Amino acid sequence: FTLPVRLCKEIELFHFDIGPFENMWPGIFVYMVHRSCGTSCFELEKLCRFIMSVKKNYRRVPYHNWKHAVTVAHCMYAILQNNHTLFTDLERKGLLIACLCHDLDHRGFSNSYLQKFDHPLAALYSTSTMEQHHFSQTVSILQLEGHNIFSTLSSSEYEQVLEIIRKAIIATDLALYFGNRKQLEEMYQTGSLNLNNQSHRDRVIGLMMTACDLCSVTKLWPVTKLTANDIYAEFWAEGDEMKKLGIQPIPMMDRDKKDEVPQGQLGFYNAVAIPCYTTLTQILPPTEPLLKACRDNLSQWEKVIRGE
Amino acid sequence: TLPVRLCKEIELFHFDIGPFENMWPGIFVYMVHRSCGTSCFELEKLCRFIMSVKKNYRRVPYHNWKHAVTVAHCMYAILQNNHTLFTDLERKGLLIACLCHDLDHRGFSNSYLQKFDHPLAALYSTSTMEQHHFSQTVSILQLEGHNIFSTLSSSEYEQVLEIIRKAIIATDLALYFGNRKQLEEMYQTGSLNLNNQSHRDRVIGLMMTACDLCSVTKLWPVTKLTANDIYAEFWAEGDEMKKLGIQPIPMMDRDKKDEVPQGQLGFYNAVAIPCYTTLTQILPPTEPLLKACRDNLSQWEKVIRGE
Numbered sequence: 340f341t342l343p344v345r346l347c348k349e350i351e352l353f354h355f356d357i358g359p360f361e362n363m364w365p366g367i368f369v370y371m372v373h374r375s376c377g378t379s380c381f382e383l384e385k386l387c388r389f390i391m392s393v394k395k396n397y398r399r400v401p402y403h404n405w406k407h408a409v410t411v412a413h414c415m416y417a418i419l420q421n422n423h424t425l426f427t428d429l430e431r432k433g434l435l436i437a438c439l440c441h442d443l444d445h446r447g448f449s450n451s452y453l454q455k456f457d458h459p460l461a462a463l464y465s466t467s468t469m470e471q472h473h474f475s476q477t478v479s480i481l482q483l484e485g486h487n488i489f490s491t492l493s494s495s496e497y498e499q500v501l502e503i504i505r506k507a508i509i510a511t512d513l514a515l516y517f518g519n520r521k522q523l524e525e526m527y528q529t530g531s532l533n534l535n536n537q538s539h540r541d542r543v544i545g546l547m548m549t550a551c552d553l554c555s556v557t558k559l560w561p562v563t564k565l566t567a568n569d570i571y572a573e574f575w576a577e578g579d580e581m582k583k584l585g586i587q588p589i590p591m592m593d594r595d596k597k598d599e600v601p602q603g604q605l606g607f608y609n610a611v612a613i614p615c616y617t618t619l620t621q622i623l624p625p626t627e628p629l630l631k632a633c634r635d636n637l638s639q640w641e642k643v644i645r646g647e
Numbered sequence: 648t649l650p651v652r653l654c655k656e657i658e659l660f661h662f663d664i665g666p667f668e669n670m671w672p673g674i675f676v677y678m679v680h681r682s683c684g685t686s687c688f689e690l691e692k693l694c695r696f697i698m699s700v701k702k703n704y705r706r707v708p709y710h711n712w713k714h715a716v717t718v719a720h721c722m723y724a725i726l727q728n729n730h731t732l733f734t735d736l737e738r739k740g741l742l743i744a745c746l747c748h749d750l751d752h753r754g755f756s757n758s759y760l761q762k763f764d765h766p767l768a769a770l771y772s773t774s775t776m777e778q779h780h781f782s783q784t785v786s787i788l789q790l791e792g793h794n795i796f797s798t799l800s801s802s803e804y805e806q807v808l809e810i811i812r813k814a815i816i817a818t819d820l821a822l823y824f825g826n827r828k829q830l831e832e833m834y835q836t837g838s839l840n841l842n843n844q845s846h847r848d849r850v851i852g853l854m855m856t857a858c859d860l861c862s863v864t865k866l867w868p869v870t871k872l873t874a875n876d877i878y879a880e881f882w883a884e885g886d887e888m889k890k891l892g893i894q895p896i897p898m899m900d901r902d903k904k905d906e907v908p909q910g911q912l913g914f915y916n917a918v919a920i921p922c923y924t925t926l927t928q929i930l931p932p933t934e935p936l937l938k939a940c941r942d943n944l945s946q947w948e949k950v951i952r953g954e
């Protein structure tokens with residue numbers, strides 16, 4: 340498993356696409372962990388066994404699948420490589436893993452639908468339902484024989500990296516991003532923001548997770564547009580299921596409103612995506628290429644609205 | 648509050664603090680209050696400290712009170728554009744360190760002192776003047792009503808005094824070469840880590856070098872005029888070498904003043920550009936220091952040709 344010449348070069352770029360060849364993705368992840376963390380961070384036999392078991396617990400859904408897991412992990416890699424001196428030894432181990440596992444066992448449905456349907460996970464986890472489950476799955480996979488990639492850490496170190504991972508996976512709940520960014524934006528403008536404060540640090544990691552999870556909007560236009568087809572294929576399926584409960588779904592998830600997709604994306608870029616990468620770039624300036632691509636894609640969506 | 652123009656231009660890296668000596672203390676207080684906050688030091692006590700520091704700098708061409716306040720401003724600019732990295736203690740201590748870092752400088756290098764057989768060279772065998780600078784800082788803090796860190800706990804007071812000590816010692820330019828080479832390797836391999844204390848000390852050591860040489864990052868007129876003051880000290884030291892029967896290096900020899908352009912060219916190539924290059928790699932927001940340094944190198948090339 341040696342990475343080809345075009346891949347070694349272009350994996351350093353934020354807008355890299357991991358390609359259609361599924362069996363190279365495990366190798367691509369190991370390359371990223373070895374460059375970001377080091378070759379002696381993990382026992383290689385355990386890591387691959389952990390990687391393949393994680394792959395097995397992702398589902399064949401249009402968007403929230405194995406490819407998305409690795410794509411999110413890669414965005415994080417690109418953030419780590421360009422802000423590398425900021426992160427602790429534990430963060431260098433736990434963040435890439437958190438990103439790989441952050442949508443483990445996704446059904447293809449929102450937290451909202453799980454509540455409406457009354458799914459068992461909704462009763463077990465009231466807030467951030469899928470996210471608490473994703474972490475639960477991550478812990479459950481670590482406890483399989485030979486899957487403890489953190490076995491050489493002390494007890495203290497093990498509990499700390501699992502907390503990092505937990506908070507990071509929970510932060511991928513988009514309902515928490517709005518409040519979190521507001522705080523960060525306020526902390527940055529008043530100059531109170533400080534990475535040596537653990538709570539402030541958690542918030543910045545939480546924003547990084549959001550930025551990685553939304554990174555499809557920071558790719559080149561063709562990747563962004565084609566990835567959009569997979570996102571809506573899931574939402575339209577959820578809206579179909581909402582109608583089967585006798586509930587009118589929001590326009591976002593109604594396939595009968597395909598025509599309004601460009602306007603819906605433009606609304607999302609202005610209200611969510613642009614603010615996320617704007618604030619991230621203020622806190623971490625080397626992440627600007629993400630913001631730059633998001634603005635280029637914003638311009639393309641309004642180019643589609645005008646009909647050109 | 649400062650006048651409107653200073654408020655705006657003090658945030659710029661290439662800011663010059665001006666000829667008005669009695670505005671410099673107020674410039675420093677302003678910088679301290681924006682980096683750290685308005686409730687870090689007791690103002691009356693801080694002003695008393697500053698004027699005692701002022702009184703213990705000497706009337707020499709370059710290593711004077713103006714140098715001290717100018718170095719502190721570069722550190723202020725660095726801290727303001729990398730505000731999230733450093734703690735409250737580190738911001739407090741680094742500005743103060745910068746202000747105190749050349750305390751009681753005579754206008755002579757360590758090598759002259761050890762070759763003259765000066766008492767300080769017997770006391771401090773390595774980084775002679777630098778160990779003296781810190782020693783002077785401690786003496787000023789020990790005076791009645793001068794301990795600006797009196798609100799701190801003992802634990803915190805010791806931490807900031809170590810920050811100040813290490814930072815001042817790093818301004819020994821003989822330590823810079825080793826420090827930069829180590830940071831370059833750690834940056835390339837990816838092992839560089841600011842949460843590692845020893846690594847963090849080195850980055851601060853490089854920041855101190857960068858602030859200390861910041862005359863090369865100003866606009867050309869400032870950079871060129873400041874060079875007259877630097878060479879005035881060096882030539883005076885070169886005269887003292889000749890007094891001892893020792894032929895000084897061309898750097899300190901006033902007979903070879905027409906080689907200055909080439910001497911400066913070689914300094915930028917070998918010390919200054921590599922310093923700010925490495926600093927920009929580790930802290931990208933300090934990039935304007937590099938650009939400006941590159942621009943002044945162009946000017947020195949332009950002087951050598953005659954253009």
Ligand SMILES: O=C(c1ccc(Oc2nccnc2N2CCOCC2)cc1)c1nc2ccccc2[nH]1
Nearest residue numbers: 513553555556570590591596599600603604606607
């Ligand atoms: O805001 C919309 C919206 C917001 C976010 C969406 O998901 C994502 N889009 C781009 C990138 N990433 C997205 N997510 C990925 C999966 O997790 C949630 C965010 C889709 C539509 C939206 N509103 C609409 C109204 C009518 C028709 C279509 C509409 N679309």
Ligand SMILES: O=C(c1ccc(Oc2nccnc2N2CCOCC2)cc1)c1nc2ccccc2[nH]1
Nearest residue numbers: 860862863877897898903904906907910911913914
């Ligand atoms: O390299 C020189 C050199 C290097 C550094 C110098 O001092 C500084 N110049 C610019 C900015 N900062 C300087 N220092 C400030 C004080 O501490 C030492 C560095 C001067 C000449 C140098 N070599 C020369 C040979 C002949 C004639 C003149 C020569 N000059």
Ligand SMILES: [Zn+2]
Nearest residue numbers: 441442511512
């Ligand atoms: Zn998710």
Ligand SMILES: [Zn+2]
Nearest residue numbers: 441442511552
């Ligand atoms: Zn996700």
Ligand SMILES: [Zn+2]
Nearest residue numbers: 748749818819
């Ligand atoms: Zn000095």
Ligand SMILES: [Zn+2]
Nearest residue numbers: 748749818859
């Ligand atoms: Zn100095």
